[PDB]
Design an enzyme around this catalytic site. Sequence first.
Site, short mmCIF file in Angstrom:
data_model
loop_
_atom_site.label_atom_id
_atom_site.label_comp_id
_atom_site.label_asym_id
_atom_site.label_seq_id
_atom_site.Cartn_x
_atom_site.Cartn_y
_atom_site.Cartn_z
N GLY F 29 -82.91 23.23 20.65
CA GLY F 29 -82.05 24.28 21.16
C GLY F 29 -80.61 23.83 21.34
N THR F 30 -79.72 24.82 21.42
CA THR F 30 -78.31 24.53 21.62
C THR F 30 -78.07 23.94 23.01
OG1 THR F 30 -77.84 26.76 22.46
CG2 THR F 30 -77.70 26.42 20.08
N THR F 31 -77.04 23.11 23.11
CA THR F 31 -76.79 22.37 24.34
C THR F 31 -76.37 23.31 25.46
OG1 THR F 31 -75.99 20.58 22.92
CG2 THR F 31 -75.63 20.36 25.30
N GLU F 46 -73.57 26.23 24.71
CA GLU F 46 -73.08 26.47 23.36
C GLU F 46 -73.73 27.73 22.79
OE1 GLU F 46 -73.97 23.03 21.08
OE2 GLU F 46 -72.41 21.78 21.99
N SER F 74 -82.31 26.53 27.04
CA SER F 74 -82.23 26.23 25.62
C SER F 74 -83.65 26.12 25.08
CB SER F 74 -81.45 24.94 25.36
OG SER F 74 -82.18 23.81 25.78
#
Lengths: 220, 241, 203, 196, 81, 243, 231, 234, 230, 101
Positions: F29-31, F46, F74
């Site tokens: 997953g995105t940070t 993000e 995330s």
Amino acid sequence: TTIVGVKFNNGVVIAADTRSTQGPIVADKNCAKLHRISPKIWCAGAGTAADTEAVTQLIGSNIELHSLYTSREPRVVSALQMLKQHLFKYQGHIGAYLIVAGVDPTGSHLFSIHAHGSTDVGYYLSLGSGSLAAMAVLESHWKQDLTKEEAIKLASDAIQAGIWNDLGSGSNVDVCVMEIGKDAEYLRNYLTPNVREEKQKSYKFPRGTTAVLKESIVNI
Amino acid sequence: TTFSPSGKLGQIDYALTAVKQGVTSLGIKATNGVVIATEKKSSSPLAMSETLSKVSLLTPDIGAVYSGMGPDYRVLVDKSRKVAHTSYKRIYGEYPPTKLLVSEVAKIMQEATQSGGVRPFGVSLLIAGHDEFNGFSLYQVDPSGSYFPWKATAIGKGSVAAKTFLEKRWNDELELEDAIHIALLTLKESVEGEFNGDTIELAIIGDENPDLLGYTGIPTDKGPRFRKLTSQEINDRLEAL
Amino acid sequence: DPSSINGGIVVAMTGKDCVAIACDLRLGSQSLGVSNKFEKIFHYGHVFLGITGLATDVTTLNEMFRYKTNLYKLKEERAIEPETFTQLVSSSLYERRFGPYFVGPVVAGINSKSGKPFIAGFDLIGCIDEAKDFIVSGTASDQLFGMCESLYEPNLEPEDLFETISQALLNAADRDALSGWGAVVYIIKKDEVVKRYLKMRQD
Amino acid sequence: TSIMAVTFKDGVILGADSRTTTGAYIANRVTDKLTRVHDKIWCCRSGSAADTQAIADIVQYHLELYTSQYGTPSTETAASVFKELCYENKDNLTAGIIVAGYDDKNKGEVYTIPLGGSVHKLPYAIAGSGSTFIYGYCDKNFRENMSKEETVDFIKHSLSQAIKWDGSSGGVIRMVVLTAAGVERLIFYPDEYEQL
Amino acid sequence: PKFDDEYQAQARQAPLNPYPGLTVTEPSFANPAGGYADGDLYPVGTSHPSQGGMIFDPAPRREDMPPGWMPGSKYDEPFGP
Amino acid sequence: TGYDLSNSVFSPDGRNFQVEYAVKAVENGTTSIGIKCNDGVVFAVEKLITSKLLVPQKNVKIQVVDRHIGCVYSGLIPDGRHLVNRGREEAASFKKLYKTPIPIPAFADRLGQYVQAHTLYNSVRPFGVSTIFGGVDKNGAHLYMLEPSGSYWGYKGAATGKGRQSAKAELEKLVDHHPEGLSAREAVKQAAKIIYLAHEDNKEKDFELEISWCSLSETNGLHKFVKGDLLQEAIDFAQKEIN
Amino acid sequence: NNYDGDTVTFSPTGRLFQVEYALEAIKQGSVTVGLRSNTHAVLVALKRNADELSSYQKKIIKCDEHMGLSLAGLAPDARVLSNYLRQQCNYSSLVFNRKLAVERAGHLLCDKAQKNTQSYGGRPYGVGLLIIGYDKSGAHLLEFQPSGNVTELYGTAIGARSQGAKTYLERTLDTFIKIDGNPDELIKAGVEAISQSLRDESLTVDNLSIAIVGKDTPFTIYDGEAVAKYI
Amino acid sequence: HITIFSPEGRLYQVEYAFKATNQTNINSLAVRGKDCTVVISQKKVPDKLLDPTTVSYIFCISRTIGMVVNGPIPDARNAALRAKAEAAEFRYKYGYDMPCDVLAKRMANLSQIYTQRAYMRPLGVILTFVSVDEELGPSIYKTDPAGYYVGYKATATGPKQQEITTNLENHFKKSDHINEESWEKVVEFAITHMIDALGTEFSKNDLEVGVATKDKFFTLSAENIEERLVAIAE
Amino acid sequence: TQQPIVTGTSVISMKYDNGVIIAADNLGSYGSLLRFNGVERLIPVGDNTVVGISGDISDMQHIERLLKDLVTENAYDNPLADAEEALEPSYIFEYLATVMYQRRSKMNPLWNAIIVAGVQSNGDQFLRYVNLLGVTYSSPTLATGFGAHMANPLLRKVVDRESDIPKTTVQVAEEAIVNAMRVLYYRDARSSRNFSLAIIDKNTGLTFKKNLQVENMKWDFAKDIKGYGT
Amino acid sequence: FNPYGDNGGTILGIAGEDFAVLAGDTRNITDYSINSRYEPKVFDCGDNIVMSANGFAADGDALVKRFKNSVKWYHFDHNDKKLSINSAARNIQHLLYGKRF
């Protein structure tokens, strides 16, 4: 009915009469009214008699189960809580009024429970149609730190006042003594002040007085 | 739990194996009483073995001992007490006889043998009890719910040797103290470790015990017939042994 | 009133070692008498149960206790004793606490093991009324209480027990409007039961 | 019944009478109407005894669970639980309750929950059948930030008048003093508060 | 000004069925309400068109006895008069 | 391997393999990060611009619970939405029984119980999201990070997603550099810089920075989103620190 | 592989195969294009016929005057999801007199679709939807996928060979969003975009279906003769 | 794959559940004084970004009962919540504070339920309840995922359980309760056994201490731990 | 709830050329006992809405909690909730009316009468009444309890029809409301001297004047009355 | 608790060739008090139908809302087709008799 509970210096004594009446008739002259919830927890009830019997049976069974489960002697407050919650759940339709007294590792306890689920701590209590007459004696003669003998005498005499002064109370006095250090002492017919008057004649009938149409032997 | 092609119930035999892995337990009927005995193991020297009793009261006239998985025995025991009260005493005002309570416990264990999502109980019970009509009784109840009455029996890892010893010792004229003597000898012969009043435990279904009734003044009530022998009581007999 | 609609009487007494239970035979709807064969005494082995009150409930409880006592006999392999039967009846009556049968039962029998006479009575909802001398139920409860109190005395042998109970029932029924049309008296012993039909006023 | 709670400079003093009656009969003359729902939270029972005791036990259960899961509750949490239980069963229930407690951030607080099941913070609250006779006295004699002795005397006089005029109120006057120091039981006998 | 009854001891219990459990005596069944158009269904609007003998002797009402009271059951007054 | 086709299973090592496979979903997953202030907490995440068709500044990924709790996650985004919905109804129930807004530790307990429950039964999948949440209550600011396994701890600064390692290193350097703690105004810009540094190892695609925060002083204790002037100040600070 | 057959099983790499195959389900379906300006939102769909003798599937579902959607993938799942969306909007109207905001509808569908991807026994919805609507905040366009993801967009295309349409939309993004005061050019751009996804087939009065909603336009679907002016 | 008998009669799933108790790699100790019971458990904070105050395995179950859990913290917190619910339920239902051993018994029964029903997995945690009972005085009760439980004179759990157990056995055999006169003294005593058995000296951050006393179970804060450590250094 | 125990008597409101004015006294009465004097019965739900409630005070607090929950749940996943897609008076009133009617249908009614007053985003004044039975209506002037009889004629004398609203300024409407409060205080036994007044204006937003006093009372004619008859 | 009231309104439907007229007063009442001078109770229902639910105002609102929901669902299902007067009559009959008791 006449119940009294009396806490004394080392325990509590619960007493009751024995007359049981349906309407204005004495259905039973020697009804036992003190019921074991446990070896050292005893109760006596008023109101709808059948409900008192059923509820005390239920609470006694549940409390013996719980004592076996926890491996501990029952607490009087445990019976109080369970009984009051059960009675409350039905919103007073069970109609069971009780004085519950007993001894447990925390001390000697005396409670009363009402059909709607309310309870009271007390040092002397009375219940039943003879409640007022017995409470008069309890108020007149109760004191702090009664000895066991004085406690028994006081409870017995309050029950006697209820017996002599109330119609729905009579015959004999039952007493149960719970004490901190030792087992409860159930005193069935502790007092017997109302012995039966003797018959003036024996009304036995000579055999053959009744007329019989048929006779048969039943194969049970 | 389903039939195998050979006709055997598949997982029950595994429960029997678990029982065979359990510690030895004994039961002996005298003419005037019943003895049930068992050694209690310890997880560590620090554990208070006096906290747990493998022998347990079901009704004041009935007692039970087991070999196998202890937690299963504990839950089965409180289930047994619940049924003995709710199903029989709540109705008839008296405790169920040994036969009836044994039947109800067997039903409890058989439901697991005939129901999905649950494994069978991993304990075999010896349920000693007394009745006014059937007299003294001793029943062995297996994981399958099959129960049979025994004059004397043993269960656990020492089953076969203890059984062959009881077959020699038992006779129709044993008194309760002779039964206790035989039980002590048989269980001592089966305990591989230390043997004293704290590792062994005994219970007896014998004569009335009004001293345990906890109250006085009712001639009709009799008091428990089941009672455990304290560590000192067992030590006295092992010293006299 | 469901208890008064059908009338009927039941009375039980204890002899020295025997019990007697007796009932009237009238069945009706207040004024009108319908049948003279409505026997209210039922037996389940060696224990006898008399039931007064609403006749539909009398029959229903006869069937219920027949079923329950037959199952008890089969799975216990022994007949239900008077004490155990009394407890069973009490528990069954309270089961319908809020929808109760309008009956008054009366149990009578001899415990087979101890051999001691036993009798007990009930209210609508199972209040046990264990008594040592005699039990009374029905529309003539008052008449029967007075009559039995006057006549009964301890340790009556079976013949005098029969005479006492029969006279009590007869004189009580003769003063009750909704009771009569004959009566039946059971004399119960450790080894036999004698059923007798009494002659009385048919009004 | 004559219940009363009064906040003061160092906390709150909760007081009540000891008489309970069934009609004209005094079924219990030394009853204790103050209940410890939590360490520094005390409630007073008014109205039906059965309803009040059931509500008190349910609230004790809920607040014990709250203490174990979320830390110590405030007086407001306790009275909110009282409010929800009373309101969701307001047709069945017939209980009016005063909730008093001490928390350091708020010092002494008093909430009153009349028979309708509403919540009100007040500097002081009077409940029970005997309160009707001391509304005027309490209104004209209450002061903000009284001292402990001043508050004790004020409650003593108020409950003395309530006991004097109400046949359903009587017996010993009991009070519980909630403060940072702790909880103090106080008891005053008829010959003490009736000779005021 | 009424007295307090904290225990609800003197608390007393549509009209009540005189004999609970029996629907044949239920007020809504003993005296059912007529249909809204029964006037148009039957001409006159209606679907349909004691104790004590010669001697003058001189039961409770379930509506003033306490909730726990069962008509005809054994009941002992808990608090007396 | 075996012993990993089902959820309610322990492997011979005592490891719930399905929970670890769910954890590996979080690692894709995105940070997303969170940072505690002296008087508040800040959240950032993000948002990768898959294409120019996405409407800017409308596909939000930070979520509020009640009014004082902020949640960011995330992994499987819909799983995070499910968890936030459960948290919202738990907060509503707490505010219904009691009246104080649900304390952040209490809310964390509720969410941990809900997530851990999904690891008990064969019939339900574990959550595929690691959620960072926190807020302000009577006892100041709290920051929690909750894993797929149901485990959660209180954190000074937390980071989860693909760039979690570099974000954690920079958060460590952050708390080291600011021993006296951060202000909300400082922490907004600081978290913007942390997120920008986090993307640098995930720079294959364009992104949008979303920031949110709650503080006793600058929101009066309510969760709010960074917008307008302050948002742009943070963006210029982050880009300057990257340039 | 052994992790494919159940929705509640993560792969060793953390993937939900049973949901990615639901995405393949949309990849099976025909192309539908959506785009918006600040004032109007447009849907364009290429319908399919089972046979030359058979009529075409209706790929546009009208919710009400302010909202509607199109389909790609399993039509019955579209029926279920659309009737649930109808239930939600109707409930909002009855209980609040409030027009259900398009973002609220998108997230409600997201929440409902997510449930099937976590509990055993449920199957992920094998259909993706494009949702357009106009409310107090202007024109909207949403993309819904089986995984539950919902995305607000200027334009998009889902279905077979939709990549070319998406490329054209990305190229012309700066243009069609400027379209103001008139829907004709927006629909023209939409039909130009969908035309990119045609192989061995062309837009015709029977293949094409067009819908639009906006400030001055309650949700209307153009088909047959009505769409002739755009083909 | 499920809690059913293997042909050997063993429940391999429950045995695997036992092995999960060591995942956290922390050791615990419980000892009984004359009038108090003490818990010592290692607090290992691998990450410097964690808030050490929130990293805990000691749980306040009721006013008198404290609990200590080894194994995954999610299962530990589930068990702690369940125990708190059971204690509140008992206080409500039976009118008095729950005994420590009776709580141990219901928790053991509940754990055994999972050991028989295949619907749910057992909890991979070992619970250690500590109290000064209203009747039985100081109490320690360790519970197992199998549904087995027993009271203890002293208890140690974790990867290095055997070493602490050996030290406790040696101390008891060389001396059932610790003869100290105040709870601080017994806390220091248990800390010294942790120091000797593990061969490691602890900072004030590495230790958790829960002390059970009449009507109060409480956990020591960092500065109280520092006080005990300096008293040991004294 | 079957019977109201603690009640707030009356609320009045009227719409003027630029908004709505609404007022209510702060007294909750336990029967004839004026028990609680600090109750607040005007419930702001935004810069564009205020809800006036009468009847049972406990049900009023329940309704206030419902409104707080509405405001809380509207902001979920609603990035525009603070300026558009915010809760209009119409949405609040419709939710309240639905809840009230449903409670009525279940024979468990909220014993309240609720006036929801505010201004829609388009600037149109919103003013509607709903009671326990679910009966709803709108009017240039609304009142509850004794206000429907005592106060409402006074307000109608100012704005008798929709044509009079633009002719009515802030000061005229506020004077009318204050005079209605004075009259209700004179003649309503359940009323109190202290009252709260809220003004929602399409331009200047919500003004909330709390704890106002009834002033300019006229009592000096009472000295001449000499009892009944002579 | 009496759950019903009477808000005192009158409606009048007249039909003939080429037209149908539905008229009703706007007065709203509770006992002897005028609630509002202008509360419309005859509604343009779309589909060239006009509806009124005069009587108890709350039940009128509820029934009108239910009929709006039902006709809208009819439009959802039957491809936005015009609803006929007899179909509306049957729909309202089923709505009304759904609460017979």
